[PDB]
Structures are given as structure tokens and as C-alpha cells.
Amino acid sequence: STIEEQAKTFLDKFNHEAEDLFYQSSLASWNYNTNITEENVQNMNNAGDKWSAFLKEQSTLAQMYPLQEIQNLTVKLQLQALQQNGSSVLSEDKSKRLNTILNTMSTIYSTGKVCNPDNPQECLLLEPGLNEIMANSLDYNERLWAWESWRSEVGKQLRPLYEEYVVLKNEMARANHYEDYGDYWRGDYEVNGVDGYDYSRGQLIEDVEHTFEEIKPLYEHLHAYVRAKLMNAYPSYISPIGCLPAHLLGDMWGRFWTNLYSLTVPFGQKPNIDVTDAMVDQAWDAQRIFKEAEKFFVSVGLPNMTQGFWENSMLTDPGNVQKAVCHPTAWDLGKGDFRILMCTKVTMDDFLTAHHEMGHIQYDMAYAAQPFLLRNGANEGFHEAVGEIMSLSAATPKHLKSIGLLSPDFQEDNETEINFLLKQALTIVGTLPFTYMLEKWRWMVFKGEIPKDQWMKKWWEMKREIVGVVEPVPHDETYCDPASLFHVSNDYSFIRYYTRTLYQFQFQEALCQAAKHEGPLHKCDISNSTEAGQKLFNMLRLGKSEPWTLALENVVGAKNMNVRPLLNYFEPLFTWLKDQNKNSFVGWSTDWSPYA
Amino acid sequence: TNLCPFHEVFNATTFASVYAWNRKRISNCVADYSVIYNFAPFFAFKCYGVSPTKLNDLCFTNVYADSFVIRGNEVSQIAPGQTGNIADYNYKLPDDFTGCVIAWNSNKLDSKPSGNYNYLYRLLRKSKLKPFERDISTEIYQAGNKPCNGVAGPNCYSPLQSYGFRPTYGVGHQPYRVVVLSFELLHAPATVC
Numbered sequence: 113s114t115i116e117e118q119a120k121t122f123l124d125k126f127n128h129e130a131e132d133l134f135y136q137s138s139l140a141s142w143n144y145n146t147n148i149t150e151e152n153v154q155n156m157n158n159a160g161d162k163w164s165a166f167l168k169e170q171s172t173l174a175q176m177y178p179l180q181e182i183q184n185l186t187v188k189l190q191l192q193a194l195q196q197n198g199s200s201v202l203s204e205d206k207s208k209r210l211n212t213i214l215n216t217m218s219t220i221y222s223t224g225k226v227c228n229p230d231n232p233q234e235c236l237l238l239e240p241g242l243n244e245i246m247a248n249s250l251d252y253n254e255r256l257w258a259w260e261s262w263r264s265e266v267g268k269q270l271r272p273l274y275e276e277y278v279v280l281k282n283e284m285a286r287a288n289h290y291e292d293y294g295d296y297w298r299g300d301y302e303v304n305g306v307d308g309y310d311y312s313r314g315q316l317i318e319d320v321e322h323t324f325e326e327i328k329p330l331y332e333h334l335h336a337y338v339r340a341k342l343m344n345a346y347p348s349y350i351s352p353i354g355c356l357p358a359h360l361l362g363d364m365w366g367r368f369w370t371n372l373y374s375l376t377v378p379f380g381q382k383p384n385i386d387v388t389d390a391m392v393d394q395a396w397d398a399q400r401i402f403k404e405a406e407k408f409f410v411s412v413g414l415p416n417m418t419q420g421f422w423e424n425s426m427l428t429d430p431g432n433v434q435k436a437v438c439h440p441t442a443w444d445l446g447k448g449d450f451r452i453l454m455c456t457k458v459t460m461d462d463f464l465t466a467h468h469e470m471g472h473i474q475y476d477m478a479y480a481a482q483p484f485l486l487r488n489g490a491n492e493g494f495h496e497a498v499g500e501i502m503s504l505s506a507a508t509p510k511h512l513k514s515i516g517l518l519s520p521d522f523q524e525d526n527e528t529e530i531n532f533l534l535k536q537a538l539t540i541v542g543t544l545p546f547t548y549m550l551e552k553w554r555w556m557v558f559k560g561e562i563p564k565d566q567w568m569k570k571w572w573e574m575k576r577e578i579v580g581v582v583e584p585v586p587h588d589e590t591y592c593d594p595a596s597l598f599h600v601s602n603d604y605s606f607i608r609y610y611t612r613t614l615y616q617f618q619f620q621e622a623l624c625q626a627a628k629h630e631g632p633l634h635k636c637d638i639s640n641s642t643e644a645g646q647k648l649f650n651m652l653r654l655g656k657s658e659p660w661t662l663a664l665e666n667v668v669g670a671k672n673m674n675v676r677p678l679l680n681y682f683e684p685l686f687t688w689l690k691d692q693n694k695n696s697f698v699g700w701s702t703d704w705s706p707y708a
Numbered sequence: 709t710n711l712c713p714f715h716e717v718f719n720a721t722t723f724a725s726v727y728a729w730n731r732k733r734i735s736n737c738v739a740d741y742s743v744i745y746n747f748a749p750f751f752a753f754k755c756y757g758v759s760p761t762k763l764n765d766l767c768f769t770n771v772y773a774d775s776f777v778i779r780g781n782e783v784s785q786i787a788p789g790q791t792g793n794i795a796d797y798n799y800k801l802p803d804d805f806t807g808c809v810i811a812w813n814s815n816k817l818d819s820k821p822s823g824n825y826n827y828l829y830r831l832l833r834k835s836k837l838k839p840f841e842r843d844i845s846t847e848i849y850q851a852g853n854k855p856c857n858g859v860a861g862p863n864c865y866s867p868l869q870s871y872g873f874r875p876t877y878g879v880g881h882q883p884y885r886v887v888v889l890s891f892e893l894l895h896a897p898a899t900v901c
């Protein structure tokens with residue numbers, strides 16, 4: 113007879129009405145993804161259209177039930193999430209125009225042609241050798257041509273489209289009553305109405321900058337080492353002191369520095385831990401790999417897999433008869449259905465990816481009890497940190513030797529420790545400044561501090577300063593350099609990757625402290641501990657029931673993220689790098705202009 | 709050699725919904741209780757009062773068998789004293805009850821890939837049922853303080869809701885077929901035995 117009772121009844125009907133449609137849509141999507149035909153794509157299209165129509169109709173129906181009148185806290189979260197993903201605002205020929213703009217951007221990003229140097233002929237694409245040559249090329253001029261060619265072909269047309277996109281997106285954000293669209297994204301890390309545990313949108317930026325300024329020393333020293341090694345390798349192309357020129361960091365965009373390996377290894381004499389040979393020696397199999405993953409995940413103290421998973425999974429390429437998109441995903445069809453779409457190739461890397469994906473699946477099983485609107489995990493970084501911690505703890509030489517793939521007579525040395533730490537750092541710490549720069553620049557662009565005419569120059573100046581890399585060739589207002597990123601082209605947030613590292617390292621430190629293990633944490637495991645399992649599972653149960661601050665307290669015992677776990681992880685590398693860089697001088701000088 | 713018709717209720721094509729659970733009374737026949745072992749391993753076999761080890765040696769006046777199809781986790785709510793949606797609204801057992809309850813998994817004949825929709829249950833009512841009563845009347849549920857016509861629309865909800873069954877559903881959502889055996893001694897002066 114009361115408003116909260118009415119809301120409870122409405123949600124009670126909504127959950128059971130929506131689960132069936134969501135299951136149908138996700139099943140159709142899975143069928144299309146494993147089987148790409150016209151009938152499948154049409155089925156997925158109509159199913160998605162029906163699901164969207166039902167969601168928007170329900171959200172419009174949810175216009176009543178004022179929140180300030182609502183007393184129960186858990187009801188407010190469901191109602192707010194429903195209102196947020198159901199709000200349809202602005203007018204026709206505007207919303208539809210924006211949707212068409214997004215579709216055109218996706219199509220033009222998918223279709224990218226570089227053609228041939230100064231010769232109109234057959235044209236490559238990023239999935240073909242276009243990025244492969246950047247990954248494995250040692251020719252400076254060849255890298256020069258392709259790196260500028262990609263931006264030359266794509267971005268010039270995207271510039272006005274991106275301007276109109278920004279204008280319309282801010283137009284919608286104004287109607288959503290948020291301060292701006294940067295604030296719209298920043299509203300995810302928000303908790304209000306709870307004493308002690310609360311988070312506003314303002315604190316996120318200051319926390320990010322504080323963490324970055326705490327991290328800067330180690331990144332500076334690693335940059336100095338990388339510059340020294342690159343000067344040793346590439347002759348007469350890099351200034352001894354100054355910004356590090358592009359085209360050499362690896363990858364099309366320089367986000368990850370892993371391809372830069374095999375050229376800056378300190379001790380190449382010692383063999384790598386890579387144990388892909390033993391798999392083919394003992395005749396391993398994908399079934400065996402996934403069974404080993406299940407054995408680890410049940411030894412830590414968590415439930416095994418399901419027969420439905422084992423029988424409906426998708427692990428090995430069927431062949432040329434049926435075409436599938438080989439990319440690891442952990443689907444959650446609902447109604448107690450879980451399966452993987454992946455193509456194992458019997459490698460140590462594939463073994464690590466299996467342990468990575470099974471973590472997401474176990475998290476999905478963990479939060480299955482909570483209501484539909486609260487199923488998705490609290491925060492957008494937790495669900496990736498939980499996946500990554502298993503990968504960190506599943507690649508240790510101790511774990512490999514215990515499994516048996518490693519040679520029982522193998523011994524660990526500080527040289528191998530340095531090699532492993534450097535290889536890990538090249539990916540773990542390299543991406544943080546890039547992510548921070550990209551998110552900060554996009555935030556400022558949305559907010560409007562930077563005028564349009566100064567976008568390119570300010571972006572390139574920021575790239576010169578923060579990450580110490582200089583543009584090789586002049587760029588003007590015609591070019592749109594950041595538009596080449598898939599994430600910025602397809603409207604995805606990007607600070608989740610920045611929060612992921614901090615969350616995973618805090619989780620790992622807490623777990624390895626719970627399971628008594630001395631020595632450096634860089635070689636730790638939780639294979640045979642039944643306490644860390646409970647510590648994890650307690651937070652995994654909640655979902656969005658409790659604020660992420662409370663979840664973090666329950667897990668580690670702290671209130672907010674800190675870089676102390678990461679620095680503790682990377683102490684030996686810091687000391688060794690300081691020892692190596694006695695003669696060299698760290699830092700950079702943006703005044704030097706090889707651009708000029 | 710005048711056997712009771714247990715085989716008829718157990719092996720049947722359809723079992724009907726929950727809110728309209730069927731009832732059947734049988735008397736004056738030779739009890740066998742051997743057909744129960746001609747089925748797949750039962751998901752749950754709990755007996756209250758009588759014991760299957762002795763079973764047929766007892767006497768009784770009347771016996772009732774009720775059958776209906778429920779979903780997975782809902783089996784646990786079928787108990788002498790418990791609380792839940794199905795026990796509060798769809799089908800209720802008295803606290804001072806004796807008998808046996810039988811349920812086995814049946815996700816091979818009641819589920820279709822297109823989605824079975826011939827099974828329903830009630831999830832919106834008031835006046836939690838007194839034990840052993842059936843409510844089949846369907847009317848638009850009143851919510852709020854507004855007169856409500858035949859059309860539901862807003863703030864008025866149509867009760868009852870379908871399960872939906874598919875072969876790929878996980879365990880705990882697969883259909884289950886339950887039969888509950890209820891009989892009494894009739895402690896009052898009884899003519900028969």
C-alpha cells in the first residue's frame with residue numbers, strides 16, 4: 113500500500129520479465145559469433161532491437177517512484193541503473209543522426225587501406241601485415257612511411273565527424289543534468305547517501321594525479337634505460353639526451369612496449385622460462401590445459417566447472433567448414449549458462465589466457481545470486497583485476513615446477529629475476545602514462561578548456577612533455593591523431609585500464625599476506641591456501657550490493673588505492689636500474705627538436 | 709490381486725501447472741509401492757512419519773496423490789515447515805503433516821528449444837494460503853489507491869507468470885516433476901482399514 117512496496121512489486125515483475133529476453137538476445141549473439149551467416153546476423157539484429165525496445169519502454173514506465181520518497185537504499189540503486197540505461201533524451205534527426213555518425217565511424221575504422229608507398233596498388237589493413245610490419249620491422253624508413261600513412265588515410269575525414277560527435281554528446285550530457293560528458297563518465301566512481309564510505313566525482317582526478325606523480329620516478333628511470341638501449345641499437349638516430357622519437361616503441365600506437373623486447377634484454381645468455389617445448393614433448397591438449405586450470409581453481413578453494421560448460425564450450429577451431437572469430441571471451445548467457453569462445457594453440461601464452469578467462473567465469477558464477485540489476489560487478493576495474501591476479505600468480509617458476517612442465521633441476525638466479533621483472537614491467541608500467549594522458553586530454557576536450565583550433569598542437573605538446581616522445585613529421589589541423597584509437601573511435605571509457613593495475617596489485621598483496629609466504633612477492637602463489645579463497649569469495653558474493661570502497665576495505669583492509677604494492681613489487685628492478693644508470697643521465701629535454 | 713493405480717499418475721504425458729495442482733483419491737485396492745523403484749534416481753526422497761523400510765505393513769483410511777511441475781531450487785520449499793514464494797502462495801503444506809514427497813528431474817520431455825510456455829505459477833497475491841487450498845481465480849492485482857478496471861496498464865499488474873524451459877538451461881532451472889503422497893490414519897472412529 114506504500115510507495116516502496118509498489119517499487120518492490122514493479123522490480124519483482126521486471127526481473128522475471130527481463131531475464132528471458134536477455135537470455136534470448138545473448139544466445140542469438142553467441143550463435144552469430146560462432147557462426148557468421150546472414151540468418152544469424154538478422155536474428156541477432158531483431159533480438160537486440162526487441163531487447164532495446166523493451167528496456168526503453170520499461171524505463172519510460174519507471175517515470176514515477178520519486179527517489180527522495182524512496183527510503184530503502186538497495187531499491188535506489190536498481191531504480192537509478194534502470195533510469196540511466198533507459199533514459200532517451202534529445203530529439204529525432206539528432207539522436208538518429210548521432211547513431212548514423214557512430215555507425216559510419218565504426219565502418220570507416222574497420223575499413224582502413226594503406227596501399228603502397230608512392231604507388232597506387234593493392235592495399236593492406238591493420239589486421240593484415242599493416243601492424244605486423246610495425247611489430248617486427250627493423251627498417252627505420254619503412255616504419256616512418258607506414259606510421260604517417262595510417263594517420264594520413266584515417267583521421268582527416270574523422271576530424272569534422274568527431275567535432276560534431278563531441279557537440280552532440282555534450283548536448284545530451286547537458287540534458288542529463290551532469291556537469292558535462294567527462295562528468296558523465298566520471299560518475300561511475302560515485303557513492304552517496306552512505307556515511308564514512310562515499311565518493312564524489314571531484315576526488316577521482318586528484319587521486320589519479322597524486323598516484324601518477326608518485327609513480328613518475330620509476331617510469332623516468334625505465335625511460336632512461338630504454339633510451340640508452342635504443343641509442344645503442346639504432347645508430348645516429350636518437351639524441352643522447354632528449355625526447356625518445358616514435359616509430360620505435362613498437363605497435364601501431366605505442367600503447368604497449370612488449371614488442372620492444374629481445375632488443376633490450378640485459379642477460380640474453382640465460383634461457384627463457386618459456387616452456388612451450390614441454391607441451392609438445394608430452395603431447396598436451398586443450399582439454400588438459402583447461403583441466404589443469406580447473407584443478408588450480410579448485411585447489412585454491414573454489415567450486416569446479418559445470419558439465420553444461422564442458423559440453424557447450426568452444427575451445428578449438430572447427431576448421432574451414434565453419435568460420436568463427438577467434439578471440440577469447442567469457443560469455444554469461446544467464447539462467448546458469450557459462451561457456452568460452454576461444455581457439456587454443458597449445459602454448460604457454462594460451463595456458464596463461466586460459467587461467468585469465470576462468471577467473472572471469474568464476475566471478476560470474478560468484479555474483480549470480482544477486483538481482484538482475486545488481487549482477488554486474490561493482491566498479492569497472494574489479495572484474496578485470498580479479499582476472500589478472502590469477503595470471504600473475506599462475507606463471508611463477510615455482511608453480512611451473514610444481515606442475516612439472518619446468519625442469520626439476522632448474523634453478524633461479526638474480527639475472528633471471530631481473531629478466532622476468534623487466535619483461536613484466538615493459539607491459540605493466542609502460543601503459544600507465546599513455547592511459548593517463550589519453551584520458552586527461554579527452555576530459556579536457558569534452559569540458560572545453562582547450563579551444564578547437566589548438567587541439568592538435570596542444571595534444572602533441574602534451575605528448576612531447578608527459579611521455580617524452582616527439583612527433584616525427586609536422587601535423588596541422590587537418591590531421592586528427594588520437595582518432596586512430598579503436599577505443600576513442602567506438603565510444604569507450606579508458607581509465608579502467610589505469611585503475612586495473614593498482615587494483616590487481618593491491619589484491620595480490622592482500623592475498624599473499626593472508627597466505628603466509630616470505631620473501632619478495634614477485635614470486636608468490638596461492639595454489640594451496642584455503643584462506644585467500646574465502647577472502648576473495650566474500651567480496652565476490654556481493655556484486656553491486658555494497659560500495660566498492662567497502663569491498664576494497666573487506667579485501668585488503670584499506671580505504672583507497674595506493675601505489676605502494678606496485679612499488680614493493682618492482683623494488684628489485686628499481687635498484688638494479690639505479691645501479692646500471694650510474695653513467696647515464698635520466699630525464700628528457702623537450703627543447704631539443706629532431707622534429708625541426 | 710486388485711492393484712492400486714500408482715503407475716498411472718507417475719508415468720503420464722502431462723503434469724499440469726502448480727496453481728492448479730491435480731488431486732486424486734484412491735481406496736479399496738492392493739497397495740504395491742514397487743513402481744516407485746522403476747524410475748530414475750530421485751532428486752529428493754524424504755518421508756515424514758512412515759518409513760519406506762516398513763511401508764506396506766501399515767493400515768490407512770484414505771490416501772491422496774498430487775502432481776505438478778516446478779523449477780529447480782523450488783523443490784526445497786516443498787516441506788512441512790518452510791517459507792517461500794511457492795509455499796506461501798502457490799501450494800501450501802500444513803505443519804502437522806505426515807507422508808512422503810517424491811521429485812525427479814525431467815529436463816528431457818518438458819523442455820523445448822523454442823521455449824515451453826505451458827507451465828505457469830502465481831507470484832502476486834495476498835492472504836497467504838491456508839494449508840491444502842487451491843486458488844485458480846485470476847484477477848488484475850490492485851496496487852496503490854486507485855480504482856482498477858479490467859485493463860492492467862500502470863500500477864495494476866496481471867498475476868501469474870510462465871517459466872520458460874530450454875534444453876541449454878543450467879541445473880537449478882531445469883524442470884522438475886514432483887508427486888506428494890498424503891494419507892492419514894483417521895484417528896476418529898473409522899469403518900474401514
Ligand SMILES: *[C@@H]1O[C@H](CO)[C@@H](O[C@@H]2O[C@H](CO)[C@@H](O[C@@H]3O[C@H](CO[C@H]4O[C@H](CO)[C@@H](O)[C@H](O)[C@@H]4O)[C@@H](O)[C@H](O[C@H]4O[C@H](CO)[C@@H](O)[C@H](O)[C@@H]4O)[C@@H]3O)[C@H](O)[C@H]2NC(C)=O)[C@H](O)[C@H]1NC(C)=O
Binds near residue numbers: 442496603605
Ligand atoms: C548500463 O550501461 C553501461 C554503459 O553502457 C553498461 O556497461 C557496459 O558493460 C559491458 C560489460 O563489461 C561492457 O562490455 C565490455 O566491452 C569491452 C570493449 O571491448 C570491445 O572491443 C573488443 C575487441 O577489443 C570486442 O571484442 C568487444 O566486443 C567490444 O567491442 C570489452 O573489452 C569487455 O570485455 C571484458 O570482459 C570480458 C568478460 O567476459 C572478458 O572476456 C574480456 O576479455 C574483457 O576483459 C566487455 O565486454 C560495455 O562496454 C559497457 N558499456 C560501455 C558503454 O562501455 C552496463 O552493462 C549497463 N547495465 C546493464 C545493461 O545492466
Ligand SMILES: *[C@@H]1O[C@H](CO)[C@@H](O[C@@H]2O[C@H](CO)[C@@H](O[C@@H]3O[C@H](CO)[C@@H](O)[C@H](O)[C@@H]3O)[C@H](O)[C@H]2NC(C)=O)[C@H](O)[C@H]1NC(C)=O
Binds near residue numbers: 184186792
Ligand atoms: C530493501 O529491500 C530488500 C528487498 O526486499 C530487503 O532485502 C530483503 O531482506 C529480507 C530480510 O529482512 C530477506 O528475507 C529473507 O528471506 C529468506 C527467504 O528464504 C529467509 O530465509 C530469510 O530468513 C529472510 O527472511 C529478503 O530475502 C531480502 N530480499 C532480497 C531481494 O534480498 C532489504 O532488507 C531492504 N532494506 C532494508 C534496510 O531493510
Ligand SMILES: *[C@@H]1O[C@H](CO)[C@@H](O[C@@H]2O[C@H](CO)[C@@H](O)[C@H](O)[C@H]2NC(C)=O)[C@H](O)[C@H]1NC(C)=O
Binds near residue numbers: 147149151152434
Ligand atoms: C550455421 O548457420 C547455418 C545457417 O542457419 C546453419 O545451417 C542450417 O542448419 C539448420 C540446422 O540447425 C538446418 O535446419 C538449416 O536447413 C541449415 N540452413 C542452411 C542454409 O544450410 C548451420 O547448421 C550452422 N552451423 C552450426 C549450427 O554449426
Ligand SMILES: *[C@@H]1O[C@H](CO)[C@@H](O[C@@H]2O[C@H](CO)[C@@H](O)[C@H](O)[C@H]2NC(C)=O)[C@H](O)[C@H]1NC(C)=O
Binds near residue numbers: 637639
Ligand atoms: C599443493 O598440494 C598438492 C597435493 O598435496 C601438491 O601436489 C603434489 O606435489 C608433490 C611435490 O612433488 C608431488 O610429489 C605429488 O605427486 C603431488 N600430488 C598431486 C596429486 O599432484 C602440490 O605440489 C602443492 N603445491 C604447493 C605449491 O604446495
Ligand SMILES: *[C@@H]1O[C@H](CO)[C@@H](O)[C@H](O)[C@H]1NC(C)=O
Binds near residue numbers: 410
Ligand atoms: C569438481 O569436479 C572434479 C571432476 O569430477 C572433481 O574431481 C572435483 O572433486 C569436483 N570438486 C567439487 C568441489 O565439486
Ligand SMILES: *[C@@H]1O[C@H](CO)[C@@H](O)[C@H](O)[C@H]1NC(C)=O
Binds near residue numbers: 526527688
Ligand atoms: C647476482 O648474484 C651473483 C651470485 O649469486 C652475484 O655475484 C651478483 O653480484 C648478483 N648481482 C646482482 C645485481 O645482484
Ligand SMILES: *[C@@H]1O[C@H](CO)[C@@H](O)[C@H](O)[C@H]1NC(C)=O
Binds near residue numbers: 719
Ligand atoms: C509409460 O506407459 C506407456 C504406456 O503404458 C509405456 O509405453 C511406456 O514405456 C511407459 N514408460 C516407461 C518409462 O516405461
